[PDB]
């Protein structure tokens, strides 16, 4: 259903954004 | 510190595995 | 179209697996 | 080490950004 899958997709998108910022932190500090 | 880097990379890898599993649950039309 | 989106999801899943393997390679060489 | 892997760090960061953009392009129930 749209709602439940939209909540899943929105979560995945923000988890990817968190990984982006975490990887940037890791690289900058390396 | 190296421990800070390790813990950060550990979480990144956990989060990537979580996204990998979540994307197998996503139904584009439902 | 559904086919456009299914293609996109398949590409994303392949890309996620690649980053998983590369993050592991990074750790193995750390 | 974490100090001799800039090229791989850069690759991972590029690939995470590419996934981010693709995730933002996904459409449900289209």
């Amino acid at each position: 259903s749209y709602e439940d899958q939209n909540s899943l997709l929105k979560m995945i998108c923000q988890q990817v954004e968190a990984i982006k910022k975490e990887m940037q932190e890791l690289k900058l500090n390396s």
Side-chain angles (χ1 to χ4, degrees), chain A residues 7-24:
Chain A
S7 64
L8 175 57
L9 177 58
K10 285 183 185 162
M11 177 181 65
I12 295 165
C13 288
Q14 295 310 309
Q15 288 169 328
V16 168
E17 177 67 14
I19 291 157
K20 178 184 175 179
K21 304 311 294 178
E22 292 166 340
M23 279 299 312
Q24 290 174 316

